[PDB]
Amino acid sequence: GKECDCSSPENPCCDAATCKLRPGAQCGEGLCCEQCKFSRAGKICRIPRGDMPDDRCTGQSADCPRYH
To answer: Where is this motif: Cell attachment site?
Structure first.
C-alpha cells in the first residue's frame, strides 16, 4: 500500500492526485510532521497522567509510536 502517504485527500502536504507527498516533504500528516516534514525526536506525542512514561517522537517517525 505504498500509494498513499497521507490519510486526508485534501491535505496540502500530500498530493491528492497520487495521494502521496508532493513537495520536498517527509510526511503528509502525523503528530510529528511540521511543514510536512518529520519533526524531531524527544517530541512528546502523548503525556500519560498517573505514573507512566512520556511518549516522544524519534525524530524520524511522523506518527507517534509507543513503548511496548
So the answer is: 49-51
Q: Which CATH number belongs to the domain containing residue 15 in this structure?
A: 4.10.70.10
> How large is the greatest C-alpha to C-alpha distance in the chain, in angstroms?
45
Domain count, the chain: 1
Give the three-class secondary structure for 14: strand
- Quote the CA–CA distance of 25 and 15 in Å, as a whole number: 11
In the structure grid, which three cell numbers stand for residue 49, read together? 497522567
Range of the domain at 48: 1-68
Distance of CA 29 to the CA centre of its chain: 5
Q: How far apart are the first and last CA of the chain?
A: 25
- Look up residue 24 and give its amino acid: G
